[PDB]
Amino acid sequence: AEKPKLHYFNARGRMESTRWLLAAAGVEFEEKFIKSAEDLDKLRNDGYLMFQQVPMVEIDGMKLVQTRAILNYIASKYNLYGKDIKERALIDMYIEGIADLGEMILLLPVCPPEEKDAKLALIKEKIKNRYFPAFEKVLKSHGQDYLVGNKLSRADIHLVELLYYVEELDSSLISSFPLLKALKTRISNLPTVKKFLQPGSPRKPPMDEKSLEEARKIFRF
Amino acid sequence: AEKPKLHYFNARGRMESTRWLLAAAGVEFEEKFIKSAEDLDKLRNDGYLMFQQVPMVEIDGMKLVQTRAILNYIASKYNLYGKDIKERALIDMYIEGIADLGEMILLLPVCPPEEKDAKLALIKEKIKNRYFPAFEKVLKSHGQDYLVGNKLSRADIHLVELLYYVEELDSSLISSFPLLKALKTRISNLPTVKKFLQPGSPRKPPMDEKSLEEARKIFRF
Numbered sequence A, B: 001a002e003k004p005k006l007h008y009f010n011a012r013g014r015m016e017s018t019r020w021l022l023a024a025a026g027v028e029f030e031e032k033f034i035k036s037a038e039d040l041d042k043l044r045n046d047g048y049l050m051f052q053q054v055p056m057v058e059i060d061g062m063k064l065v066q067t068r069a070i071l072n073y074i075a076s077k078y079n080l081y082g083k084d085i086k087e088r089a090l091i092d093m094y095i096e097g098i099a100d101l102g103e104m105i106l107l108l109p110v111c112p113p114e115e116k117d118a119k120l121a122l123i124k125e126k127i128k129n130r131y132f133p134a135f136e137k138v139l140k141s142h143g144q145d146y147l148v149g150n151k152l153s154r155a156d157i158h159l160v161e162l163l164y165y166v167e168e169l170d171s172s173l174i175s176s177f178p179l180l181k182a183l184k185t186r187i188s189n190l191p192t193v194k195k196f197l198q199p200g201s202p203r204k205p206p207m208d209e210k211s212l213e214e215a216r217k218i219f220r221f
Ligand SMILES: N[C@@H](CCC(=O)N[C@@H](CS)C(=O)NCC(=O)O)C(=O)O
Pocket: A013, A014, A052, A053, A054, A055, A065, A066, A067, A068, A219, B096, B100
């Protein structure tokens, strides 16, 4: 059928978790970068963005917007959303925790200059005291290589992605969590994920001041 | 069986959409209201809350936290999450838009007072120009009574709940959307929803200043 086509700007932002999930699933996809406000405005005008926002992914005849809609579909299509309703419940609880922490970190460079330092410290206390203990506890509960059902799921991929971002923020936050470190290593060594982590893949770099200014002139904030 | 048990404070907050969904489904439930910081410490120390937060719902032997994990489980169990993964994609896309708008409205009372006037204006412009147009377009395109699949789903319930909140904010905003007004009426007349809407149900009132102070006392924010 059609190769999925990912519409976003040339940055991580809200599309990166999708690039991770598709890559991990071994699914070939294409990207179409929005480079100007005019590119975005054409997509809006032409009715391809339900809420006038991206990310948008063209897949299986849909113009799918909303990150969780995109990810839920891709996870189901490629058997990374568990085997039944009860496994999906555990997966959803786990990844919604990942989303909450992820969202905090995502928005840190948006924080007013004089609130930024205190926001970082609150994120670090949450990582150390709430999120990393919760996920370490799951991995210690069963002692297995994957978070849910002894099988690779989206939860492992989303979690490992976030451990990369936490590492960029402060490399010591993970030090007291040996099962999380071991998960990061194993998932990073899955053939598909390894290729994703290697140069020339669609994986995107940390946003710098000049990619931030591009966001500003496209999405106008 | 055993009725779902909903752990939250006696208020709408992040638990109201689950009350709406269970009620719509015809599912009888129990609530255990958190009334003190001590009540919450106890849920936390007892290991009931994966990320130390509520909502939490005890259902079918699980202690489910995270709103979306709770709702996704309920919706699948009671056949309100569509017939296959493509209808689920449409439902997710729609309801995530509803979630974004809902979140703006939910958080409005905690907006810095200096920001409330401008933000309320932005929210009304997004209702009139972004969200209501998107759902009216979906309804106009297929001419059917329900958002997805010509059949009741969670999307119809979540949207109608939101239409009630928008009506609370400003009753004029829906005026130029006849299809949304018709959806509101039809759904509000389904026996389960009609009963939920009548005095005496578990439906909660608008958060006032004192319910908000209660929350500060309990969650120490
Ligand atoms: N809840 C949405 C949020 C999407 C979103 O905020 N997109 C931004 C780009 S990251 C956007 O298009 N902003 C333009 C606008 O809101 O008008 C999702 O997760 O997909």
